[PDB]
Design a protein around this ligand. Structure first.
Ligand SMILES: *[C@@H](C)[C@H]1C(Cc2[nH]c(Cc3[nH]c(/C=C4\NC(=O)C(CC)=C4C)c(C)c3CCC(=O)O)c(CCC(=O)O)c2C)=NC(=O)[C@@H]1C
Ligand SMILES: *[C@@H](C)[C@H]1C(Cc2[nH]c(Cc3[nH]c(/C=C4\NC(=O)C(CC)=C4C)c(C)c3CCC(=O)O)c(CCC(=O)O)c2C)=NC(=O)[C@@H]1C
Ligand SMILES: *[C@@H](C)[C@H]1C(Cc2[nH]c(Cc3[nH]c(/C=C4\NC(=O)C(CC)=C4C)c(C)c3CCC(=O)O)c(CCC(=O)O)c2C)=NC(=O)[C@@H]1C
Ligand SMILES: *[C@H](C)[C@H]1C(Cc2[nH]c(Cc3[nH]c(/C=C4\NC(=O)C(CC)=C4C)c(C)c3CCC(=O)O)c(CCC(=O)O)c2C)=NC(=O)[C@@H]1C
Ligand SMILES: *[C@H](C)[C@H]1C(Cc2[nH]c(Cc3[nH]c(/C=C4\NC(=O)C(CC)=C4C)c(C)c3CCC(=O)O)c(CCC(=O)O)c2C)=NC(=O)[C@@H]1C
Ligand SMILES: *[C@H](C)[C@H]1C(Cc2[nH]c(Cc3[nH]c(/C=C4\NC(=O)C(CC)=C4C)c(C)c3CCC(=O)O)c(CCC(=O)O)c2C)=NC(=O)[C@@H]1C
Ligand SMILES: *[C@H](C)[C@H]1C(Cc2[nH]c(Cc3[nH]c(/C=C4\NC(=O)C(CC)=C4C)c(C)c3CCC(=O)O)c(CCC(=O)O)c2C)=NC(=O)[C@@H]1C
Ligand SMILES: *[C@H](C)[C@H]1C(Cc2[nH]c(Cc3[nH]c(/C=C4\NC(=O)C(CC)=C4C)c(C)c3CCC(=O)O)c(CCC(=O)O)c2C)=NC(=O)[C@@H]1C
Ligand SMILES: *[C@H](C)[C@H]1C(Cc2[nH]c(Cc3[nH]c(/C=C4\NC(=O)C(CC)=C4C)c(C)c3CCC(=O)O)c(CCC(=O)O)c2C)=NC(=O)[C@@H]1C
Lengths: 172, 162, 172, 162, 162, 172
């Protein structure tokens, strides 16, 4: 598993190369902004149960077929399995937010996911909706201008949205 | 690759738990230490050719038989002198990589794993590299915590060879 | 309704406290970004018709089911409804930007709006899409570097993002 | 809460319109005036204890019966003197709050609404508080437009008391 | 018990490794964060009784039935009032402990382990304890990073209950 | 396993008590001394290999019967194990130094060790000598006044001798 610093380290090693100042600066500016990355993880994690539960309620409100008898999310075992997937995906996304690199989400969560859903008949389209709803909730919470020193979280928020869209693409 | 951040993540994942405050404190400590770490890495990188050329001569001066005894494993030759310098730059590069990552990871994956196998197989002796690392410590010019950071990782390499 | 300053004051009253010397410094900083805040509001407002109509056109091109007969935005009465909502949300976003605080958007626009659409049969998902398109257009316009004294508006644009993010979060 | 910004927004929302230049100009005036009003709020805050104790003393010297008449509503006891000093700091604190907000809102919401019911119910006479406010105006030592700002919110409370 | 210091040691112990620079960074981060943490912990310990009472009244108010329904599980008797207030103190004592340790370990071990089993067996609704913690979050008085520290372990309890 | 903070918390919970200012103050004081604690672990750890080898060499010179044929440290397998044991004890001592509490050392290293030696035939008195050598070397290295901001680490050096003598007591 790589964090953002290890990713640059590994790319330089494959070339046999010390780092350049462009690379030093890059990473060092990443550090300088680090408090914002901690607030984002703290904010999404601290609200995970709400993010999952509202996203799930929204999804089944939009796609009622999922919870009709016979629906892929009907019965309590399949509903809880759905909710579990929603927490797991949110979990691995926040891991990636902390790392600054997709690799932990990619290796331990996304790889093989689409084939998994294609195997159980779970509609990956609908998983994708659930992921986009969690994305909108998480970005609102993390980017919430209330209750935090004001500053520019914009590059970071584009990164977070990146990880969520990457999940959504992966499951459908 | 082992860093403070991947280790914090690894701990949560092993327990199936979202990240907690427990872990965010770890990474903050990494971020605040990173100021000293990249200074040292910057200084070692900007002055690597000196450190390398001087650590090589340092090994020759302490084990001058490595400059004359016949064999592949010795800096008896041009090719050998070039190998030895290559190896020493490798250790230096890895020290800077650890400083950038804030952990032993890069050195562990790229150099220490298999280290004993390689030195035994090619009859290279650890004390050779230990002296080169001693030289790097003594001449990086670092002060303050930048210096403490560099020497932590240089001593780690040395422990590993011992 | 609170603006940024009124919020600091109401937080301090609940404590029975005077403001700190640190807090006053923080407030000087708000005052200093004044001109940029006005630029942003002027710029978004002056282009509101375009922002709304381009966003709605893009939405109906992506989601033609909305304008199929039977669709939620079919009939001129419903289409006008839809554009009115878009207009309203943007208006309330622009108010939050003037205020430097989300409370006017949250209290007069967002609170109860999910339940409203759920009850209407309006797909909040699609609404969130319209909001994201207005978002990307508004920020591009407010942060357009031509025809303005050059400088750095990144924080202000981070904050503006936050108000759109709330909006889009709130409608599913 | 009434401020120049919430008035501007409240104007346009009542008419269901976007903000116009009409409202942006008013907010700009508020940003411009903030230099002087935040200077006033800081200075009063920094000097607050002495202003409060001095105001209380002005009240007692002007209305000495407040320190001798027996009754919970008077400052004739340790506790009535604490109540009074408390109230006077409330007044000063709300003046600083108006200055920070750029408007009468804070004082309107937290103090003036209900003011005269409370003074009547609890037999507190408005003239006591007017003298304390006069004392504060006379001794905050501010000058220029910062003076004008402080005095505007003080004379506003005095009006409310009259 | 889970703290940043035990996680660090546990990490190295599990690789049968001496501590490295990777781990000491985690501890320093905790040491620096302890300033906000220990401040939040002291504040809630001082204000404990009132947060607890305020919290129970907040709960009895959002769930009026908890005080009218007969049933040993309800605060509809003096015994159930004392049970409920005892419980709320337990939650608060657990936040304080997490602040002192710099981690969730104490709450995990002493309250979250088996939490679901108890609330089910004894018919205690999670919503009640969630309201209580919401009240504590809203009324502790903290500002800055102390507040951040208290609400993280409060929101962690809320999550556990959700 | 407990650290100094968790031990206080575990004591308090057993009584149902919030912490006293005594304990708050004590633990806060450990935190302001924390830089020294980190210096000591890093210093000892960075010299681990030589602390162990010098101590082993010194033990065998005082106790050559251990390496005579038949002795407990004779053969390379037994020599490796003895050296290993020395590394293991030192490492757990350094865990205890970081934690500010002997519990990790007690639970995971010292508990049952005396009986293990009695079983195998290993002279625990000699292990205690080996441990007491590593202590003298470790403290001298941790408390070297060169290359470090000057100050008094006497309180800490006493704590550290604490953990070594505990360990040595437990095998002897
Ligand atoms: C985008 C995420 C939003 C922000 C973020 C933002 N935060 C800060 C300051 C800041 N954040 C922290 C938080 C932590 N430090 C830790 O060690 C941990 C883990 C326990 C956390 C969660 C601190 C300590 C600070 C500095 C103190 C302060 O309150 O200012 C800033 C200021 C700049 C900076 O320090 O990087 C910003 C911009 N603000 C927004 O407007 C975005 C919505
Ligand atoms: C990000 C928004 C882009 C900026 C903004 C920017 N503006 C200014 C100066 C500036 N803006 C105004 C505008 C107004 N004053 C008012 O009272 C009103 C309401 C009718 C408006 C619209 C003024 C008067 C000024 C000062 C004079 C000038 O024209 O320069 C700056 C300069 C710094 C500052 O004052 O903060 C900037 C940077 N420029 C960019 O490049 C961003 C994309
Ligand atoms: C007895 C142990 C000797 C001391 C120690 C001593 N150190 C310091 C300051 C100090 N030490 C560090 C070390 C670290 N901080 C970290 O996060 C890590 C892990 C990466 C380490 C290894 C720092 C950063 C500092 C602060 C900066 C500085 O160099 O001063 C002091 C000063 C007091 C204090 O900071 O507590 C002392 C006294 N000095 C002696 O003379 C003893 C032999
Ligand atoms: C909810 C948004 C949608 C679901 C989800 C759903 N999933 C399953 C089974 C299921 N899900 C996974 C996912 C993962 N396992 C992992 O290890 C990881 C990463 C660590 C992930 C992301 C697996 C492996 C499985 C199969 C095993 C199991 O069910 O326990 C179900 C139930 C399948 C069934 O009962 O046939 C469901 C319902 N379904 C929807 O309709 C929602 C769109
Ligand atoms: C220099 C201090 C003394 C040497 C140097 C020397 N080394 C070699 C061969 C050699 N060195 C390595 C080391 C590494 N390979 C890696 O990938 C890494 C980490 C990235 C390291 C540290 C290896 C694996 C090898 C063998 C394979 C190879 O040739 O690259 C030689 C030549 C050995 C031979 O040809 O038999 C020499 C001379 N010897 C001295 O006398 C110097 C004192
Ligand atoms: C457009 C992108 C999407 C719509 C929107 C749509 N909305 C409605 C009705 C509607 N919208 C609101 C929202 C508000 N009323 C307020 O006062 C405020 C804040 C001031 C808000 C945000 C309300 C209350 C209503 C009901 C009142 C009404 O119908 O006029 C409709 C029409 C519903 C109908 O007539 O059946 C539509 C179509 N529809 C889409 O398809 C787009 C995704
Ligand atoms: C001081 C100039 C003179 C006093 C003062 C005095 N006041 C009271 C009671 C009192 N004061 C208030 C005022 C406020 N409550 C608010 O919330 C606000 C706005 C933030 C204000 C200005 C109230 C509501 C009350 C009654 C309730 C209470 O005790 O707090 C007393 C004691 C009254 C009594 O118990 O009889 C006194 C003595 N009296 C003098 O003689 C001084 C000149
Ligand atoms: C208060 C919000 C609401 C209650 C409170 C209530 N609780 C109980 C019994 C009860 N509570 C616990 C909780 C804990 N025990 C622990 O050890 C810990 C961690 C340290 C916790 C959080 C337990 C285990 C029990 C049952 C065992 C016991 O009696 O102690 C009652 C009475 C239940 C009964 O006797 O049947 C009540 C009333 N009920 C409400 O209505 C309040 C809203
Ligand atoms: C060296 C200074 C002295 C010895 C040491 C010696 N020990 C052993 C075997 C031995 N030691 C342990 C201790 C531990 N195992 C653990 O996992 C832990 C912490 C988790 C500890 C503290 C064990 C369990 C064993 C038996 C297992 C094994 O040998 O692999 C030997 C081997 C004796 C033999 O093989 O017959 C020795 C030599 N001997 C001396 O003379 C020194 C005083």
């Amino acid at each position: 598993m790589l964090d953002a610093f290890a990713k640059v380290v590994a790319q330089a090693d494959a070339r046999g190369e010390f780092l350049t100042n462009a690379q030093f600066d890059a990473l060092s500016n990443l550090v300088k902004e680090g408090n914002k990355r901690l607030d984002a993880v703290n904010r999404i994690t601290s609200n995970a149960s709400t993010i999952v539960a509202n996203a799930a309620r929204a999804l089944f409100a939009e796609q009622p077929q999922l919870i009709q008898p016979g629906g892929n999310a009907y019965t309590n075992r399949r509903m809880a399995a759905c909710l579990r997937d929603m927490e797991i995906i949110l979990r691995y996304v926040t891991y990636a937010i902390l790392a600054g690199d997709s690799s932990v989400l990619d290796d331990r969560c996304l790889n093989g996911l689409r084939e998994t859903y294609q195997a159980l008949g779970t509609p990956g389209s609908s998983v994708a909706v659930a992921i986009q709803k969690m994305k909108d909730a998480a970005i609102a919470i993390a980017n919430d201008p209330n209750g935090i020193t004001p500053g520019d979280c914009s590059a970071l928020m584009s990164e977070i949205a990146g990880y969520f869209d990457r999940a959504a693409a992966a499951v459908a | 690759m082992k860093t403070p951040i991947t280790e914090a993540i690894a701990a949560a994942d092993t327990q199936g738990r979202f990240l907690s405050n427990t872990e965010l404190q770890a990474v903050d400590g990494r971020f605040k230490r990173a100021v000293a770490s990249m200074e040292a890495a910057r200084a070692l990188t900007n002055n690597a050719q000196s450190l390398i050329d001087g650590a090589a001569q340092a090994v020759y001066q302490k084990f001058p038989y490595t400059t004359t005894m016949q064999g592949s494993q010795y800096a008896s030759t041009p090719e050998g002198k070039a190998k030895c310098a290559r190896d020493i730059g490798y250790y230096l590069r890895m020290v800077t990589y650890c400083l950038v990552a804030g952990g032993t990871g890069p050195m562990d994956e790229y150099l220490i794993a298999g280290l004993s196998e390689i030195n035994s197989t090619f009859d290279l002796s650890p004390s050779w590299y230990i002296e080169a690392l001693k030289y790097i410590k003594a001449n990086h010019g670092l002060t303050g915590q930048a210096a403490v950071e560099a020497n932590a990782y240089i001593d780690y390499a040395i422990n590993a060879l011992s």
